[PDB]
Homo-oligomer: 205 residues x 3
Amino acid sequence: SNIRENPVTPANPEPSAPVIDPTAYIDPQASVIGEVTIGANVMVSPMASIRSDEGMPIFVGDRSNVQDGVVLHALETINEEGEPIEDNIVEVDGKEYAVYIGNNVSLAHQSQVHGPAAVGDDTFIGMQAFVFKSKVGNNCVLEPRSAAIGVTIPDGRYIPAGMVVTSQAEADKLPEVTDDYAYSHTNEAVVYVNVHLAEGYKETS
Amino acid sequence: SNIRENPVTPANPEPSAPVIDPTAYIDPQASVIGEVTIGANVMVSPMASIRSDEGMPIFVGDRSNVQDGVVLHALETINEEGEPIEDNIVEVDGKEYAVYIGNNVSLAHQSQVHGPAAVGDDTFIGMQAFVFKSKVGNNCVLEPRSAAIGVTIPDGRYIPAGMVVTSQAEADKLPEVTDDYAYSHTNEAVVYVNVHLAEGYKETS
Amino acid sequence: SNIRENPVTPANPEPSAPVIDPTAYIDPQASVIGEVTIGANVMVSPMASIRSDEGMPIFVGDRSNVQDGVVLHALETINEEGEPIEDNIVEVDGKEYAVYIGNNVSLAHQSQVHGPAAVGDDTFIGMQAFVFKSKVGNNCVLEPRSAAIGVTIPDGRYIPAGMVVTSQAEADKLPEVTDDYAYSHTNEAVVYVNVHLAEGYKETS
Ligand SMILES: [Zn+2]
Ligand SMILES: [Zn+2]
Ligand SMILES: [Zn+2]
């Protein structure tokens, strides 16, 4: 099966199986492994790989979408000595995650979010974009081919296409999403469409 | 099966199944969904995802190749009210498409062409490259990691590796393919090889 | 099966099947085709595509890892007239390869190494990175989204995130890995974890 438990390792004594809301659609050509929670009405497309096999949960919130070829994975969060590596764990609303994807988030084709990372609600992570060791706020837009590494992206900001942001000084000066900005309504449209696609694909299964 | 119809949605009353020329080879580990036409002698490699589930056809012309990990998808072209979103439709030779890939085109590994987009004949779209909301002319070369977003690329131009072109002023001043240019003969070689690979893989099926 | 022989072509009279060490783990959702040798304790993750169908071997050394969505492929190394195209062949320790990946190498998620290319031992090829027509030395680090095209990267150097290196003058002046560098210990950690993951996944098969 393409939905599978993670293996036993020196840092993982008990295998976990994914917890998937019954209204989510997981394409048969996607792969979901290990300690993963997938919320309601989520669409996981062909060739996506969500792999949680190094400790700690990967969480994908309600009405989010994980498009074709997207990879979610995380650095080790528990060492061989059972010691939690706090640098590799993100905290959201009192709970620890390896990767936290909020509600109404679009992870567009071929993007990747690698833990430790958190992505806030109503954020569009554009095609081929990359997020690693970063917290991306709510209502953000990562344009195609942008990247955030090692930074916190404030709420309501966008990263222009192709820009690789690696310092907090840069992240603090990113431009704001405004109504006239080209991608200001992109995520709400993509979420609306993908929630309906998930329901349609479920009716073919 | 990995060749599938698209689902019924509020903007898609009738499911469509792919129309695939009998001389094309579709790898069993590729995914082809929905309103897609694939021409003669096309090779579709493992892990490619061609997904046409938001209205309007994705067309891949004769003797083109869609290499490993390539994604083709398109923005919605028909809204919930049956109204065609003309901004998301490209026109080629009197016909409307969500994504049009011409003849003798190579979409190299991990590239992505996202509709609305058209790619003219004898063009090489290099490894990891990205095309979105753009028309790429005939006899063009997108070097690896280049991108064209929101522009028209004139015939016979190349985009240097890593360059992200987002304005028409930039696109108009791209360099020309000449005989001495390093990638001037790359596409013709890749097409020749892939047409022969398609025939060889067909003989193993 | 997802482990397959390459097809007969005008430049490939005899099909080859992959040679895979019994201690390697190949995920069922990976694809391995043709003249490929995979060493001991290698982990090949979901959605990777290793395809050797244009002549000459792709070699992946012991204790290396090929992560999700990684593509390995190579340009033609033998023409239709049986003539070896020496420009497309790399030489390592007296033997010819299309792609040579050394021991203890991490090819991180969504990266791609396209032949002709060689990657030396104990090198980390970061997420979404790209190597083509290049020799990368031992103990190197390609940060996420970096690329090396047409160059030789000296031993013990790193390429900063997002940088596309296309000239030898640039490659010669890359910074050195030192103990205080952020990724100086990344590869050794990733190799340690992936060798243990390979053993755990083997125990579930
Ligand atoms: Zn990882
Ligand atoms: Zn799309
Ligand atoms: Zn190739």
